[PDB]
Structures are given as C-alpha cells and as structure tokens.
Amino acid sequence: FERDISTEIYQAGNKPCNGVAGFNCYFPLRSYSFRPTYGVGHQPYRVVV
Amino acid sequence: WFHVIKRFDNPVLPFNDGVYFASIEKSNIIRGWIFGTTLDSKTQ
Amino acid sequence: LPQGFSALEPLVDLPIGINITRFQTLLALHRSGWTAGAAA
C-alpha cells in the first residue's frame, strides 16, 4: 500500500549517475507494450484492488 | 526535553519507529509537525 | 513532566501509505525581531 514516485536513477556501482544513465546506471522506469495484435502477455488488464 | 523562550529549538530527527509527543504548551504556540523522508520535491 | 495516568483515546487513522523516515516540528513566532514565549 505504498506508491513509489521517485525518479532517481538506480546506482549499481560506485560511479555517481548524476541524474542520467550510463555505466552501472539504469532507468528504473520502463514502458509497457500494450498492443491489440499480440497475445495475453501484451494485453493490458484493468486491475482494481 | 526541548525548551523555547531566547531559544529557538527546531531540530530534525529521524523517524525510525513511532514517536510520542508531549507538550506543556500555553496559548497554543505549537501548530503542527512535518513528516518526510528528505523534505523536498523528490519525495512526498 | 507531571506524574500521573491519562488515557489516550484514538482520534484519526489516516491511510497515508507513504514512506516516513524523518520528522521536524513546527513553531509559531510572535512579532513585536521576533519574540517567543516560554514553551516546552
């Protein structure tokens, strides 16, 4: 029941990412692949809890 | 124990667990508190 | 702190659902610089 809205770049190594991706730095946010011509895995589902 | 009089004690302390706040206050000097991980726009 | 027993009834259970790891209290000042009364 906690929402994560931090846009900080994830740091894996000792080099500071300085807000951008690079060596041992990756963007935690990834986009979905919702398309109507694909299978169940790419099919979006409306989940309400 | 923190005393305010010319004393201005407004420190920042980490929130590791629950806290108990007792105030011997007159004329409602205290108004509220601020809670946050880093107290900036990067967090809520 | 006076010595005694005082029940603490619940008032508000707000479902905040966020991470909290630090806190800082707020104070109100009076302008006559600024002058603050006795408090603890």
On whether the CB atoms of residues B32 and B23 are closer than 8 A, the answer is no
For β-strands C34-35 and C30-31, DSSP reports them as antiparallel
Q: Contacts of residue B44 in chain A, CB cutoff 8 Å?
A: 5
Q: Contacts of residue A6 in chain B, CB cutoff 8 Å?
A: 42-43
B37: DSSP letter: S
Quote the minimal CA–CA distance from A9 to chain B in Å: 12
Give phi and psi for A47, each to the nearest 5: -105, 120
How far apart, in whole angstroms, are the C-alpha atoms of residue B17 and residue B19?
7
- Residue A10 pairs with which residues in a beta bridge? A26
- Dump strand ranges (E) for B1-44: 12-14, 30-35
How far apart, in whole angstroms, are the C-alpha atoms of residue C39 and residue B9?
10
Structure tokens at C2: 């006076």
How far apart, in whole angstroms, are the C-alpha atoms of residue A40 and residue A45?
9
On whether the CB atoms of residues B6 and C29 are closer than 8 A, the answer is no
How far apart, in whole angstroms, are the C-alpha atoms of residue C39 and residue B43?
32
B13: DSSP letter: E
How far apart, in whole angstroms, are the C-alpha atoms of residue A42 and residue A28?
20
State the SS3 of chain A.
CCCCCCCCCEECCCCCCCCCCECCEECCCCCCCCCCCCCCCCCCCCCCC
DSSP character string of C19-36: ---EEEEEE--EE--EE-
**Count of CB contacts below 8 A, A vs C?**
7
Q: What b/e string do you get for C1-40 counting C-beta neighbours within 10 Å, with b at 16 or more?
A: eeeeeeeeeeeeeeeeeeeeeebebeeeeeeeeeeeeebe
On whether the CB atoms of residues C18 and B44 are closer than 8 A, the answer is yes
How far apart, in whole angstroms, are the C-alpha atoms of residue B41 and residue B39?
7
Give phi and psi for C30, each to the nearest 5: -115, 135
B29, B32, B36 ranked by CB distance to C22: nearest: B36
Å resolution of this model?
6.2
Quote the minimal CA–CA distance from A37 to chain B in Å: 38
